Amino acid sequence: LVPVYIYSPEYVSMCDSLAKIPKRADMVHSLIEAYALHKQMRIVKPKVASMEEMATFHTDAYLQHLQKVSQEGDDSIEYGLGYDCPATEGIFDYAAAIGGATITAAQCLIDGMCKVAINWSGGWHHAKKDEASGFCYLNDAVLGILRLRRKFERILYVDLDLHHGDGVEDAFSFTSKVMTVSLHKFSPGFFPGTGDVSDVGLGKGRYYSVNVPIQDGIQDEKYYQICESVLKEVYQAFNPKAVVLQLGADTIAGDPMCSFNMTPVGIGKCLKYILQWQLATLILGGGGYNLANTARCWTYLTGVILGKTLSSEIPDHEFFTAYGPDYVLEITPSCRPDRNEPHRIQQILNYIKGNLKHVVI
Ligand SMILES: CC(C)[C@@H]1NC(=O)[C@]2(C)CSC(=N2)c2cccc(n2)CNC(=O)C[C@@H](/C=C/CCS)NC1=O
Ligand SMILES: [K+]
Ligand SMILES: [K+]
Ligand SMILES: [Zn+2]
Known part of the structure; x- marks a missing residue:
């Protein structure tokens, strides 16, 4: 079964109609289209939500x-x-x-x-x-x-x-x-x-909320170790039947937020681990305020979902000029220190591990 790719030219233009993040949706689709990844997916026209559907x-x-x-x-x-x-x-x-x-x-x-x-x-x-x-x-x-x-x-x-x-x-x-x-x-x-x-949810939902506080400057290897460690425990205890994955690209190096120091390859490993579960998976975007880098990331991740390795050179397209001065797909992490102390990280993982023991279905 091929992945479903929610897209229509009217949908993309509508997503950029507020201009909060100028033409990002167009840049993302154009890069995906430039790598011809949409050819390998099942394009599905999105329906418009009714008043009742939004009121849920x-x-x-x-x-x-x-x-x-x-x-x-x-x-x-x-x-x-x-x-x-x-x-x-x-x-x-x-x-x-x-x-x-x-x-x-x-x-x-x-x-x-x-x-x-x-x-x-x-x-x-x-x-x-x-x-x-x-x-x-x-x-x-x-x-x-x-x-x-x-x-x-x-x-x-x-x-x-x-x-x-x-x-x-x-x-x-x-x-x-x-x-x-x-x-x-x-x-x-x-x-x-x-x-x-320590925020773990309320009432019947107690311990069914998991939060992983991280500090500035984290890179791919550390992030994936933390993420795999948590997801491994979460999957075993909660046994999900479906997954909704939010992949905000404002963790990526070069983002104006300038907090985390990630590359799309690191996020891709987390995605790969989740896809390994072979559950019904809903992939979502989110943050991402370095336009070209966000297009770079989500295009790469689309390649990961399709199990394809894309060429390093950014192909000529509508927004090709925006990918300078390197014009490649790979993103280089910034020269910025990692503020995450190993002992603090292990504490958090142990804390979460203790919480998930209460979770039993
Ligand atoms: C300029 C910058 C701070 C930008 N802000 C804005 O563009 C505006 C619209 C202008 S001033 C402002 N908002 C504002 C003022 C006081 C408090 C907050 N915001 C709290 N909200 C955020 O910090 C969201 C945060 C975005 C989060 C994306 C999460 S995917 N926004 C911002 O980074
Ligand atoms: K919950
Ligand atoms: K998050
Ligand atoms: Zn964000």
Whole structure:
């Protein structure tokens, strides 16, 4: 079975319509297209999310506000839209397209159309039920998981974005049918502030939330050791039936965030380990603010999913000029120190290992 690739020219243009991260969705698809990887996948046109589908997580008051300002424009209520005053009218359609695409990919998984479904323009994990947050206006990850819960009894959410996927974790904080695992930078003052190793969920969902606080400057080898160690324990204890994987590329060297020092090869190993489970897997994007590097990463990861080694030279295409001055696919880690102490890392792993002992199905 070939991977499902959620794409349409109308979808890509809609994903860039807010211009929060200028033409990233187009650059990502164009590079994938330039390597002709789409030829090896099953292209699926995304459906648009209805009001009811989006309301499975987001409140009516929030959604109705987005639809209203799409029609009329912006003591007003706080929905986290204070940075979009010049243009709020396109947010509702953006959210509906983002939401619909991830739901579509999830439905493909349910229908048995594939084992892997890809939506690189999704993975907006910060959005709350009643407010936007961190460039996330709608949490498609939550909508995707909720859709998969119709078919699969236990869902594992893995968030490899630089930031803590607080929106997704809070959505399922009280349930034990969905386990969230997040690897992220954790430091006083760093967005979004949550996701300490001691945060393990609430009520029936206690110990069904896993957080791995990491410090600046981590590289491929250390990251994969940490990630494999956690996933190994999580898989054995929770025994997931489906996986939703968020692959925010703002961990990659060269990103304006300038925190982690990763390359796409390191992320690719984590992905390879997850794919090894051969479970129904929903692949999502997320953060990534070095445009060319994000296209580089997600194109490489697409190659990993297809089990193909791409040529090192960036092929000529629409955005070829943006890949200078090297014009290659490989990304070189920065000359920046690793702030992660080995003893602290082992403590965290042991702490999590203790937590997962409580998890028994
Ligand atoms: C400029 C930079 C800080 C940028 N910010 C913004 O572009 C705006 C829209 C302008 S000022 C601002 N937001 C802001 C002010 C106070 C507090 C926060 N943000 C907390 N939120 C974040 O830090 C999200 C964080 C993005 C997280 C992506 C997670 S995948 N954003 C930013 O890095
Ligand atoms: K994360
Ligand atoms: K949970
Ligand atoms: Zn991020």
